[PDB]
Amino acid sequence: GSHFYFLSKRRRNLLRNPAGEEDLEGWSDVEHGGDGWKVEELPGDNGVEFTQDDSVKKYFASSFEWCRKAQVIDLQAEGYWEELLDTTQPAIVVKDWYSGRTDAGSLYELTVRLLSENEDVLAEFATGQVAVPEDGSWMEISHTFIDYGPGVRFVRFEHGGQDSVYWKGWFGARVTNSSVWVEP
């Protein structure tokens, strides 16, 4: 069938700037609720250690009203041709890491869609409003989209956070180490 090969050589995070090294570049539809997003260094203020990819240095901190950002991944531009997406329908894997501070609560949300050439929603993974753990530990969201049918051409990845105390500043969910990949 193989194939496996074409997908193994293309296999890479397809999100640009998953951690904040490039500030907010690569992110579109940025919604700066309250004092907006801010990139901060890894251990944050009343934040726990990220023990997991030592190579991740930073995270995006949300504020006192929803902060949302998104990325649309053009699968053809990343090397996946039409027939391969319509026919094989390879696994599209989507992860995010989020956390909260210890002196204040926060909420987190993620939605990811598989879209067609013309923005038709073929598939969707949604968490709804999530309570971020109060103790400050890091949480992994993971989803694998398979058997999604033909037509998938983009992945739209979107996440957000805000605080739960309505505080001037950056007390909302923190997000980092985001990824989407096509897996063999």
Ligand SMILES: CC(=O)N[C@@H]1[C@@H](O)[C@H](O[C@@H]2O[C@H](CO)[C@@H](O)[C@H](O)[C@H]2NC(C)=O)[C@@H](CO)O[C@@H]1O
């Ligand atoms: C959005 C805004 O203007 N929020 C205010 C809060 O920030 C205030 O609460 C206070 O916020 C800070 C962090 O921003 C703390 O360091 C501080 O302890 C805190 N104070 C209190 C009494 O809770 C707020 C309170 O008066 O007023 C706005 O809600």
